[PDB]
């Protein structure tokens, strides 16, 4: 009962922390920083620096399909559905369809009166792949949504449950993870889902405690490719406690001595724009000497970015529970 | 560097008939009008599927059975556990209807019945525009995709006369934040019901791209023939009008709430509701018929010496 309220307040505070300090992570004072952040790297420029799309793909990508050329394949399928004439039941014909292996429950569903509709799939539209599908936020709902919680997806006559990945909607080659669904602009949700050819509308629902589905987002299916990489970003902040001319001694970013050697080649930046490099560890406590391009202020905060490619979690559930009739809270 | 007078600079040496247009415009107009006439003739006529209309009341003060009593040519009333969706035939007006209704808040009911509908009729009350449930349904319905829609009001004539005009004035303004340029029909009497039916039959149709590229179907009748009842899995016979495209049996058939399935046969019995009053069509060839393959089918130191001095 009240532990739900506790988790709600924790999520509110965590969202406020995220919108205040974007991806700042406190260095673990116990576990070595090359163990927590082992699967991380640093990029000189987030936009222009390369990243292999096929590098270190998970086991789940062994299970999905991919288009060599999605645009030309979609053009071919749309052309052969608009131009050609296949021998089948025509439009307007009252037919009966003998469909093979259906659970009995669907039938009993028709017996209380729920509408029961069907549609025919295009080729390749039953196979699973990665759906990159753009959504904003409906202003009626202001409760937080974290990155990989379950949501109900209405996407092009199909209704399912999955754990999305929220990413920035930009024009770059790689896209930064958004740890929350930010309620002002347009983000991308990445899902393991069956293939659908666009256009299709997106309706993100969150299942509530009282059975209602609250509407959180709206949008369109943008693309079907698993080559879109989501890039989780971790920001490590240290303090420049000893300031010289174009050189400083920075503490609190690391605590072990060889952690500074591990994350040595990653460039540094300050909150007031100054860039530079780690010169050398001081010793035994993670203090480091860093060479910067200018003099520093006493209130400065040195910080460093670490990037790791994330993929969504395979929680594709084709069953969605029926709502209770929605009422205003 | 600008050269001065001591540098050599040499100034350059400068150095259809009226009747043919009328005939061409007439030809193009004839082409456009015949295309439009074919497309408008397809929907709701004798050679085409019924005009399917979803009635949604956007307030709790709206008495939906009153409106569906006003809406019902001859009426063939298909009837379910709680809902009454009926066929209407108007041979004087030469047009065939299938009226369904759905209440807002019931998400999957309105979303399915609005993803097969040709027309959506939103009911309103004279004083407030819509409710909170109606506003939520409107957000979902706009997001999913609206077909042709019409706005009808139910309680204008019940008010005293001296306010009715200005009541409608406020109502239009209350509507215009979401429905900017839309006519508010009044549905109070049988004559106004006929006017609304006429407005619904002749109106330009919004074409939704997703359902127009795909062959879809709304079940008018369903029956279950189980292979084994204890197994709870058997063949399903679903009867309805094909709506979107030509239907091929060699393709997977997705039921919206229950995933995709393999279909084996298409028969074409008699049309139960023709506008003006057992043959099997296609069986599945077990070779070119697609299979349900969602996932890939292929599976020397002393005892006390410290680490320093060592």
């Amino acid at each position: 009962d009240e532990e739900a309220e506790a988790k709600m307040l924790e999520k509110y505070k965590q969202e406020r922390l995220e919108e205040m300090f974007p991806d700042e992570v406190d260095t673990p004072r116990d576990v070595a920083a090359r163990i927590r952040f082992q699967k991380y790297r640093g990029l000189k420029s987030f936009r222009t620096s390369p990243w292999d799309p096929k590098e270190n793909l998970p086991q789940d990508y062994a299970r999905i399909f991919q288009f060599q050329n999605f645009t030309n394949t979609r053009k071919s399928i749309f052309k052969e559905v608009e131009e050609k004439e296949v021998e089948g039941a025509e439009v307007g014909w009252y037919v009966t369809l003998h469909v093979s292996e259906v659970p009995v429950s669907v039938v009993e569903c028709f017996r209380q009166g729920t509408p029961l509709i069907a549609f025919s799939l295009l080729p390749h539209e039953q196979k699973m792949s990665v759906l990159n599908m753009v959504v904003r936020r409906d202003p009626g709902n202001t409760e937080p949504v974290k990155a990989k919680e379950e949501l109900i997806f209405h996407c092009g006559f199909r209704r399912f449950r999955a754990s999305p990945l929220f990413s920035q909607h930009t024009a770059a080659d790689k896209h930064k993870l958004q740890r929350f669904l930010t309620a002002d602009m347009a983000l991308v949700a990445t899902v393991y889902a069956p293939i659908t050819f666009p256009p299709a509308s997106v309706l993100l629902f969150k299942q509530k405690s009282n059975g209602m589905h609250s509407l959180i987002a709206t949008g369109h299916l943008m693309s079907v490719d698993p080559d879109r990489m989501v890039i989780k970003r971790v920001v490590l902040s240290g303090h420049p406690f000893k300031i010289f001319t174009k050189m400083a001694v920075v503490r609190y970013m690391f605590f072990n001595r060889e952690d500074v050697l591990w994350f040595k080649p990653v460039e540094l930046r300050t909150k007031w724009g100054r860039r530079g490099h780690i010169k050398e560890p001081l010793g035994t406590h993670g203090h480091m000497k860093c060479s910067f391009d200018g003099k520093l202020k006493s209130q400065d905060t040195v910080l460093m970015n670490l990037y790791k490619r994330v993929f969504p979690k395979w929680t594709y559930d084709p069953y969605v529970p029926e709502p209770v009739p929605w009422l205003k809270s | 560097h600008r050269p001065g007078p001591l540098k050599q600079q040499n100034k350059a040496h400068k150095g259809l008939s009226r009747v043919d247009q009328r005939h061409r415009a007439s030809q193009l107009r004839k082409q456009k009008k015949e295309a439009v006439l074919a497309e408008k003739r397809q929907l709701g006529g004798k050679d085409g599927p019924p005009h399917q209309v979803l009635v949604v009341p956007l307030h709790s003060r709206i008495s939906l059975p009153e409106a569906m009593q006003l809406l019902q040519g001859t009426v063939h009333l298909n009837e379910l556990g709680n809902t009454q969706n009926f066929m209407l035939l108007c041979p004087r007006l030469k047009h065939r209807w299938f009226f369904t209704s759905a209440r807002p808040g019931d998400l999957h009911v309105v979303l399915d019945m609005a993803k097969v509908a040709d027309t959506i009729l939103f009911l309103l009350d004279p004083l407030e525009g819509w409710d909170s449930t109606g506003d939520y349904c409107l957000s979902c319905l706009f997001a999913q995709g609206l077909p042709t829609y019409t706005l009808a009001v139910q309680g204008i004539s019940g008010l005293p006369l001296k306010k009715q005009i200005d009541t409608r004035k406020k109502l239009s303004k209350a509507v215009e934040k979401r429905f900017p340029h839309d006519k508010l029909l009044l549905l109070d009497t049988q004559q106004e019901a006929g006017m609304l039916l006429r407005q619904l039959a002749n109106q330009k149709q919004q074409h939704l791209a997703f359902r127009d590229r795909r062959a879809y179907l709304f079940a008018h009748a369903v029956d279950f023939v189980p292979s084994e009842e204890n197994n709870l899995v058997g063949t399903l016979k679903i009867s309805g009008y094909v709506r979107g495209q030509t239907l091929n049996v060699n393709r997977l058939l997705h039921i919206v709430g229950y995933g995709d399935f393999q279909m084996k046969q298409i028969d074409a019995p008699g049309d139960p509701f023709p506008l003006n009053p057992k043959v099997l069509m296609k069986a599945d060839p077990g070779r070119q018929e697609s299979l349900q393959a969602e996932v890939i089918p292929d599976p020397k130191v002393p005892k006390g010496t410290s680490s320093y001095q060592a």
Binding site: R34, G42, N56, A62, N69 | -
Partner: peptide, 23 residues
């Protein structure tokens, strides 16, 4: 012997490729 930049040469890019649909 490793750091955050050299260990990136360890990761391969030829095992878990999704099955490709051709044109």
């Amino acid at each position: 012997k490793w750091d955050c930049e050299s260990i990136c040469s360890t990761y391969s890019n030829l095992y878990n490729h999704p099955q490709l649909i051709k044109y």
